[PDB]
Amino acid sequence: SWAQSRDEQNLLQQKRIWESPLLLAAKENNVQALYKLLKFEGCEVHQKGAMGETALHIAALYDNNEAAQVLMEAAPELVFEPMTSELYEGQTALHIAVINQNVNLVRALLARGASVSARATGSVFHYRPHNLIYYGEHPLSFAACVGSEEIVRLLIEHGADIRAQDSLGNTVLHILILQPNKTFACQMYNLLLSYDGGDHLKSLELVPNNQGLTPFKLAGVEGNIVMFQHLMQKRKHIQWTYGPLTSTLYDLTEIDSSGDDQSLLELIVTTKKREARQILDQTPVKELVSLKWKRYGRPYFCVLGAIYVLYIICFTMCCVYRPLKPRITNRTNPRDNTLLQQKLLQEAYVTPKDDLRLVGELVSIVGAVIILLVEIGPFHVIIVTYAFMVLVTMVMRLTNSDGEVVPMSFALVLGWCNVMYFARGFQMLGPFTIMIQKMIFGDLMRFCWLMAVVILGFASAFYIIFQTEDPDELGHFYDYPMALFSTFELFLTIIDGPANYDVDLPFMYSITYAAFAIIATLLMLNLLIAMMGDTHWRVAHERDELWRAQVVATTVMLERKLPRCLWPRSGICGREYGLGDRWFLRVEDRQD
Amino acid sequence: SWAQSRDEQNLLQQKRIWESPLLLAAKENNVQALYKLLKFEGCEVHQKGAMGETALHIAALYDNNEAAQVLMEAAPELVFEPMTSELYEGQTALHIAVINQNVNLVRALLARGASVSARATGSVFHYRPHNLIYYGEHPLSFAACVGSEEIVRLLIEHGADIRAQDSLGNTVLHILILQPNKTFACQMYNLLLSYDGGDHLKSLELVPNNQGLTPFKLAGVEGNIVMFQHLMQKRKHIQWTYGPLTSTLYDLTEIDSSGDDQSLLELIVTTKKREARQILDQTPVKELVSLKWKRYGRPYFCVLGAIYVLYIICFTMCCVYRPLKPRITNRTNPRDNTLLQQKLLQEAYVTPKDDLRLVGELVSIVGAVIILLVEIGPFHVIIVTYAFMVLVTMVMRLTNSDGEVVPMSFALVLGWCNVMYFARGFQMLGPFTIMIQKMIFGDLMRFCWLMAVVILGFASAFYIIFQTEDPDELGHFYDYPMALFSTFELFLTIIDGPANYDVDLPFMYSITYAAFAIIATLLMLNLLIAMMGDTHWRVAHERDELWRAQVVATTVMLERKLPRCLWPRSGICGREYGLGDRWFLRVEDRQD
Numbered sequence A, B: 001s002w003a004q005s006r007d008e009q010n011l012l013q014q015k016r017i018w019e020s021p022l023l024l025a026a027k028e029n030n031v032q033a034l035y036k037l038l039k040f041e042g043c044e045v046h047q048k049g050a051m052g053e054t055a056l057h058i059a060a061l062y063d064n065n066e067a068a069q070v071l072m073e074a075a076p077e078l079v080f081e082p083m084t085s086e087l088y089e090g091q092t093a094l095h096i097a098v099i100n101q102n103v104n105l106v107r108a109l110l111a112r113g114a115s116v117s118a119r120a121t122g123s124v125f126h127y128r129p130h131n132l133i134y135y136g137e138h139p140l141s142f143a144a145c146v147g148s149e150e151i152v153r154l155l156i157e158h159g160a161d162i163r164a165q166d167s168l169g170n171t172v173l174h175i176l177i178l179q180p181n182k183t184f185a186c187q188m189y190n191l192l193l194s195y196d197g198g199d200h201l202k203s204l205e206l207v208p209n210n211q212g213l214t215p216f217k218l219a220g221v222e223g224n225i226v227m228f229q230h231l232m233q234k235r236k237h238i239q240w241t242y243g244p245l246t247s248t249l250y251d252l253t254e255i256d257s258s259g260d261d262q263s264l265l266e267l268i269v270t271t272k273k274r275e276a277r278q279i280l281d282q283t284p285v286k287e288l289v290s291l292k293w294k295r296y297g298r299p300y301f302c303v304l305g306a307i308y309v310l311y312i313i314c315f316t317m318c319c320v321y322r323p324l325k326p327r328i329t330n331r332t333n334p335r336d337n338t339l340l341q342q343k344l345l346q347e348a349y350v351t352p353k354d355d356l357r358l359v360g361e362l363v364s365i366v367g368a369v370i371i372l373l374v375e376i377g378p379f380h381v382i383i384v385t386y387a388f389m390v391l392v393t394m395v396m397r398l399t400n401s402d403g404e405v406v407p408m409s410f411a412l413v414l415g416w417c418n419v420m421y422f423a424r425g426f427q428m429l430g431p432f433t434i435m436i437q438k439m440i441f442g443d444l445m446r447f448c449w450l451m452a453v454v455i456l457g458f459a460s461a462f463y464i465i466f467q468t469e470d471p472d473e474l475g476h477f478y479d480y481p482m483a484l485f486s487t488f489e490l491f492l493t494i495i496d497g498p499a500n501y502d503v504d505l506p507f508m509y510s511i512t513y514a515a516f517a518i519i520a521t522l523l524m525l526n527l528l529i530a531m532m533g534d535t536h537w538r539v540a541h542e543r544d545e546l547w548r549a550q551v552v553a554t555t556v557m558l559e560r561k562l563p564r565c566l567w568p569r570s571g572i573c574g575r576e577y578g579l580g581d582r583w584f585l586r587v588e589d590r591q592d
């Protein structure tokens, strides 16, 4: 494994420190032992350790300015030495002093003339979840993250480029957004903007990430509210203050769906970050998305819903009124238990009342392909498998298979269960269907493994009990799978429970069923108690917040496909008003 | 839209400020640029902006006393200039200085001799929910709301009329009741009473609103408890203090049902404000309404209930004993499945035991019209549609329609479900029926849209499954609507679930029904979890407080219609006791 290699390598490093008396004196800060190993008896002063480290690298890991200066005065070429290992490919003695906030050592390293543009491209500095931190690659990025503002400016004084980016295309501004201490990073964020070129163009705040992401836009996708609020101050204009009233004008540029994909709204709903959902509730955004839904958002959803309501009620109209026949096959020739009246008409006549079904079946297929034309959570796979069954039913049609009902049956339930997709938004039943959206694809698929286990124990027993018996009376279990299906219904207390009082029931049934009825209710009551985990207040607020998320996700969805002659752009543009042609949303609020 | 017009107009205003260098210097407080545009090069000093504003109006929006004085010394006619726009029709430069609490500017504006009676009748000053504030129209009303007591008296010093009202008929006292800061408005409320004429008659506290509402009475209807408690000090008399005991005598004039509609109790239950419900729980009112219910309130409700219990049990007595006939029509001539024994007697004989039904049917109709005579929440539409069915049944009678049962059936359920209206009050089951009162007309009408959706998917499938089959055995679904009604019962687990073990069931039934049973229980368990939202403590207190509301609403209802020889007036009158002929309620309490 990779996690054990670094565990072994870190253990392997301490061995080379103990063995090499130079690195041992560099670790323990033994000043007298260094002059004994350098000036008197010349040791290998460029001694590479297990992690490709020098004696100075060890003298910097443990804050030892004395042992560092003895190594720099007796060998001033160890300063430029980078780590020559795989885990630490690139790290130098300045990176270690900047991390440990050793200002006097950074001062002495910069007096010696160390590199202020050395990258630490080792695997331990990569942005991975198994790495506990991520401060970038450059020494300026290390100083900004640890919060040492004295070292930050001290590095700029010696020629540190704020523009420089790492292997992931992140400037020093992008790295500060991925940090825990947000309340102190806002002060650090302003400090690095002060060293910008001063020109309105080619600003550091506009340098994009390699995935097309500005520092402002990254704060929303990552869920950093403190940096989102702080970055919002730079892009909002107050119009006037009238006592308690204050009408402020927000910029509304990267926070709107104007680019083909560069949009902060399109990144909040698509990302899986549970934190980013709180950014559309922020005071520049929540005003926007509320107006997008109250007008032109909510009505178009009802139109698309009502159209889908009629389209599905038409498909059912074609099923209830389909071909007929009082059964051309002879009689109950296979087994006597058979109630079949096959309703298959391969002919295209019956013109009186069949011409209505002709256009009805034509509507169902051109709508099913339109559903697929616009496709070429869970309600997404339901609507596509529905239209797949329509074409398979159309393929089952014109071939006239005896299994003409099996593909047509799935399209019934999938067609309506996808109209409760429109429960999203619309009213206050949206959070109810997002509560079952988690239920069907969360606990259900796991909870059934425990219920099928209890069934396959009692069902495979009840069949043995009534295998000796006669299925003609009390035939709840007669087949191998029909014993499972009857016990399945018995687990939910739907069937009356096998009870024939004229005959004599086997002695094992009256014992096994008593144990089944108790265990089945305990599994059902404990299932109800397990539902109480989502009943504390936050969970009622969580699903109600997740409901607004999929409402905003629907609002952005309708704006993309719908035309532009309807649905005007958000805000009032910067033309015809003395603005910068960018949009703006006038939002006035009242304090207290 | 109207909300975008003001957004555009506010953006359009800033354009005219930037364009007009007079208004730009008036906004930016550029003193040197004003003398360059007034004394040297004469600009249009009466420059009307986009919002009908002058240069002084802009110099007052942004606290700029320097730019204001330069405009007033070089043009002392801008002070009287009001805003000449639609949004701000009437606002002057004094209103803006009073709002911003610019005391030195108000002092300088009143030294110039500005109008202290100018109304701001613009649409933005109207009492609308889209307007964030509402301070009235007069400058004295602006000073009182912002809390600047120095400007309040400074305006009175220059001839401000406290009596003046706005377009809604509200004095300065009415406006203070609609404000958030109540703890500081009580101090401001006393300040404006001190400037009253000093005579006991024509007081400012007695000037009514245009909707018949005194400042005291408005505080109760609006739900302002702090002003209700403060206003109560002026109208309560302490009789004696006996250690911990203190018997106080409350006025009880506008807080009783004496006028035809001027009554604080009649306004608390009729209004839809959820806050006003806490005013009948206040310590002058709660003592009253408790005594009104314990005696003469609760017994009369039981009498009216017991009368309605017997009146409805009589209507059922007339239905169970109605005309008979062993069926005059021939046999089962339409379809063989028919169990009809029509019980229709158009003749008025059968005198032995029919004379009891004659007066019984006469009682049911004179009581149904009495129910309508006294009519010419939900239990209000139930009782009126019940008596509507009685007359329709009376019209169905004497015409002898074969549908004589359909109008008579509705009157059965509506007659009893309106006797659990008497669960209101009576005992502690009142809050239980107010819990289902929200259920029937709240979640139910919305929750059914999701259940009918799941039914119309599985019901329209089960019919297709058993359309090939023979309805004679396993005929749960045979008609188009009977497939819906059987699946509806199956959704609530009432029917045993279609199970015929002698025949062979179609292969799609055993698959579709397994999916229906799971989805039906998940919709039922998630419905039970959705009920837990009203289980936190306040909701138990909310419905118990809403129960007392409809109890008090019933207590006031019974006092209006019932005669006056019974049910004496509340309190002890001010005659025969040295009082002012007004109630009074003696209430003693114990402190600690």
Ligand SMILES: NCCOB(c1ccccc1)c1ccccc1
Binding pocket: A374, A375, A377, A378, A379, A380, A383, A418, A421, A553, A557
């Ligand atoms: N290709 C259509 C996308 O619309 B979706 C959709 C629309 C109607 C019916 C079913 C699905 C959608 C589903 C889940 C999340 C967001 C959108």
Ligand SMILES: NCCOB(c1ccccc1)c1ccccc1
Binding pocket: B374, B375, B377, B378, B379, B380, B383, B418, B421, B553, B557
């Ligand atoms: N016109 C009769 C009014 O009485 B109500 C009423 C009385 C008896 C039966 C049904 C209704 C009433 C209903 C709801 C709220 C307040 C009163």
Ligand SMILES: CC1NC(=O)NC1CCCCCC(=O)O
Binding pocket: A010, A013, A051, A053, A057, A058, A061, A096, A124, A125, A131, A132, A133, A134
């Ligand atoms: C073995 C080490 N030698 C060294 O000079 N630093 C070491 C460890 C610190 C690096 C931690 C980087 C990380 O885990 O993110």
Ligand SMILES: CC1NC(=O)NC1CCCCCC(=O)O
Binding pocket: A240, A242, A245, B010, B013, B051, B053, B057, B058, B061, B096, B124, B125, B131, B132, B133, B134
């Ligand atoms: C555009 C404005 N010009 C001005 O002198 N005041 C302005 C706005 C303040 C009025 C706010 C009143 C309200 O919204 O209630």
